[PDB]
Amino acid sequence: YFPTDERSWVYSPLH
Amino acid sequence: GGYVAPKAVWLPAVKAKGLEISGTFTHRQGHIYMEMNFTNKALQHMTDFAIQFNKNSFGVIPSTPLAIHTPLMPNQSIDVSLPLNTLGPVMKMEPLNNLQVAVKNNIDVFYFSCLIPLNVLFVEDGKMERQVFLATWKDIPNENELQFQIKECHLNADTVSSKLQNNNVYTIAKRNVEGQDMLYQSLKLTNGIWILAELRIQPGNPNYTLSLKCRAPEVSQYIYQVYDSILKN
Numbered sequence: 635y636f637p638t639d640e641r642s643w644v645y646s647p648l649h
Numbered sequence: 650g651g652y653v654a655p656k657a658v659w660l661p662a663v664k665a666k667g668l669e670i671s672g673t674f675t676h677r678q679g680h681i682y683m684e685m686n687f688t689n690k691a692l693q694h695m696t697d698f699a700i701q702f703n704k705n706s707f708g709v710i711p712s713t714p715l716a717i718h719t720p721l722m723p724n725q726s727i728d729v730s731l732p733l734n735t736l737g738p739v740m741k742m743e744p745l746n747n748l749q750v751a752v753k754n755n756i757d758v759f760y761f762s763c764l765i766p767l768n769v770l771f772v773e774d775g776k777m778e779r780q781v782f783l784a785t786w787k788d789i790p791n792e793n794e795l796q797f798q799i800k801e802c803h804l805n806a807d808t809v810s811s812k813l814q815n816n817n818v819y820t821i822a823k824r825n826v827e828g829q830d831m832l833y834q835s836l837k838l839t840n841g842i843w844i845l846a847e848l849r850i851q852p853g854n855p856n857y858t859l860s861l862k863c864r865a866p867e868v869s870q871y872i873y874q875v876y877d878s879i880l881k882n
Contacts, residue, residue, distance in 0.1 A: 635760050636703045636749050636751065636760065638701055638751050638758065642701045643699040643700070643701050643753070644699060644700050644701060644711045644713070644714050644715075645697075645698075645699040645714060646697075646698045646699065646714040646715045646716070646717050646718060647714065647718060648696070648697075648718060648719070649718040649719060
């Protein structure tokens with residue numbers, strides 16, 4: 635575990 | 650192409666409710682990739698994928714999302730090539746090349762770690778001009794100079810040079826002294842750090858002596874690791 639910030643997530647687009 | 654480590658299971662199914670990720674790192678002609686395979690061993694699909702890396706020593710960060718655009722179905726496997734760049738936030742890791750990764754889907758957030766082979770961070774423009782090499786070698790304080798034995802090595806100097814050059818470790822000069830080959834080499838990392846080397850290859854001696862000079866001498870041990878892996882493969 636390490637602390638994650640929401641804005642650092644790289645989300646995949648959905649097709 | 651450069652040396653690529655064998656693929657490893659970075660996140661086994663048992664640790665991530667059926668999600669399994671295996672991968673390796675490559676450097677292709679400019680460009681760093683985390684080359685991965687994702688398998689869903691669970692009984693329900695997984696979607697809403699996202700990824701982020703913890704701050705790390707060389708500021709490694711994904712340059713695009715994971716190319717997973719539809720639900721990953723039970724027993725399905727997909728190969729994913731994730732481009733990376735070194736423009737992200739920096740924090741010292743231990744080991745230096747350790748990379749902590751968080752991957753989430755619709756089920757949970759999972760965490761694993763993997764080592765980034767230091768060679769994938771050797772830049773293409775790492776060939777120092779001869780005279781700049783001379784000035785740079787002299788300028789690095791001699792207390793920074795660290796010596797390593799590459800033990801039990803059975804390659805000749807030309808093969809040593811050619812394998813290293815394939816990995817952006819450049820042979821800048823060569824001399825034969827008393828039947829001993831001396832190679833002068835340079836490389837530069839993605840963060841701007843220059844490492845200079847003298848490699849000495851001696852008659853019927855199975856140990857090469859590698860002398861490294863770097864303004865950040867903590868990196869030198871990692872570079873020795875790399876030379877050893879390259880030359881043994």
